[PDB]
Amino acid sequence: ETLTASRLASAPPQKQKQMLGERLFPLIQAMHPTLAGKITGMLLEIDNSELLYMLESPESLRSKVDEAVAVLQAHQ
C-alpha cells in the first residue's frame, strides 16, 4: 500500500510519525544504509505534509538525506 495524506490524517496523531518512519527508513536505506536509522530519525522532524511529498519524490528525499548527512559531519 501507498501512504496517502488521507490515510495518514485518519490515523491517531500518536501514530503518525511512527507510520512515516516505517516508510521512510527503507528508502533512505537504499541510498545510505549505514546512517539510515539516524537520518530517518532526523528527517522525521520535518512536517508530515512535506514528508508525504518526499515519500513520492525520490530527488527531494535524496537532497534531504544529503543535507542530513552534512548536519552529522563534525567540524574540520
- Out of Cl ion, a copy of itself, none, what residue 30 binds, judged by CB under 5 to 8 A for its kind, is none
Q: Where are the alpha helices (DSSP H) in the chain?
A: 5-10, 13-29, 36-43, 48-56, 58-72
Residue 38 binding Cl ion, by CB under 5 A: no
Residue 32 binding Cl ion, by CB under 5 A: yes
Q: Which of 30, 56, 57, 58 is close enough to bind a copy of itself by CB under 8 A?
A: 57
Say if CB 3 and CB 55 are below 8 A apart: yes
Return the residue nearest Cl ion (CB atom): 34
Place of cell 514528508: 51
User: For the chain, what is the largest distance between any 2 Cα atoms, rounded to a whole number of angstroms?
Assistant: 46
Region from 5-13, 35-43, 48-56, 66-74 binding Cl ion, contact rule CB under 5 A: 35-43
